[PDB]
Amino acid sequence: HHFEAYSLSDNDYDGIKKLLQQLFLKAPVNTAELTDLLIQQNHIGSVIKQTDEDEVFGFISLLNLTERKGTQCVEQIQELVLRFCEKNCEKSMVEQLDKFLNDTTKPVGLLLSERFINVPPQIALPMYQQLQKELAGAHRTNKPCGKCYFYLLISKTFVEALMFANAEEEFFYEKAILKFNYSVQEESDTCLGGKWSFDDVPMTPLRTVMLIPGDKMNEIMDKLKEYLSV
């Protein structure tokens, strides 16, 4: 099974959108507007295709949340994590989450990395390495995507103790200065040509929100290389 990574394209609109919908289900975030925002972003982000060839097996990209103020879906994502922070966390944690998201001097970059479960997990390493190269290039050329102090990751997670659909996201969670989980009710498993999914022990679907400082990313990349190298 050979995979190829391409820049985001208008042709990948449907595949990127479905992957976003697997993540956001029915929460108040416009997956269509978000997909358009990702595709519009130039030199950042890549899609995985198997080389059938139209199908988007995965994608990774970054959005600078303060740069993209004025986009509705970006505001929606911020209001989404805050509202679930309010419901599931102590006000002290809510205050600082809100402070982190409104700190213009230290921008927060939303990291979106979604893939079908059938793709081999080792592909995660080239995806993050390529994104790291692109983020360094953006930082070199004074673009806002290369100027993030913090990275916000929303992960698909479950408990029967915290377990990740994308296993590599354990390394981000370990380094997160702020983290919490919220329960999801649509419970939509991945659509990977796969009819259904089964667990021998019952599981509770969750989303885990985590905020990771930029200085920890080189340590995260190092485990990625350690565990996923092929």
Transcribe 55-117 into DSSP letters. ---EEEEEEETTTTTT-HHHHHHHHHHHHHHHHHS-HHHHHHHHHHHT-TTS-EEEEEEEE-T
Report the residue numbers after which the chain has a gap, meaning the C atom sits over 2.5 angstroms from the next written residue's N, or none.
51, 160
According to DSSP, residue 224 is labeled H
CB neighbour list of residue 76: distance below 8 Å, 6 or more residues apart:
28, 29, 30
Other C-beta atoms closer than 10 Å to the C-beta of 193 total 8
Residue 196 CA to residue 161 CA, distance in Å, equals: 24
- The Cα angle at residue 64 between residues 18 and 179, in degrees rounded to 5: 75
Nearest to residue 115, comparing CAs of 153, 157, 60, 167?
60
Residue 210 CA to residue 212 CA, distance in Å, equals: 6
Domain edges within the chain: 62-228
Phi and psi of 212, rounded to 5°? -120, 130
**Taking a C-beta distance cutoff of 8 angstroms, is the pair 102, 82 a contact?**
no
Residue 4 CA to residue 23 CA, distance in Å, equals: 23
Nearest to residue 157, comparing CAs of 78, 210, 120?
210
**Taking a C-beta distance cutoff of 8 angstroms, is the pair 37, 68 a contact?**
yes
Phi and psi of 167, rounded to 5°? -60, -30
3-state secondary structure of 208: strand
| Distance, CA of 85 to chain centre | 18
Residue 76 CA to residue 4 CA, distance in Å, equals: 32
Phi and psi of 4, rounded to 5°? -130, 145
Residue 64 CA to residue 138 CA, distance in Å, equals: 12
**Taking a C-beta distance cutoff of 8 angstroms, is the pair 37, 63 a contact?**
yes
At 38, list the tokens.
Answer: 């990702």
**Taking a C-beta distance cutoff of 8 angstroms, is the pair 58, 114 a contact?**
yes
**Taking a C-beta distance cutoff of 8 angstroms, is the pair 212, 153 a contact?**
yes
**Taking a C-beta distance cutoff of 8 angstroms, is the pair 209, 180 a contact?**
yes
- Resolution of this entry, Å: 2.2
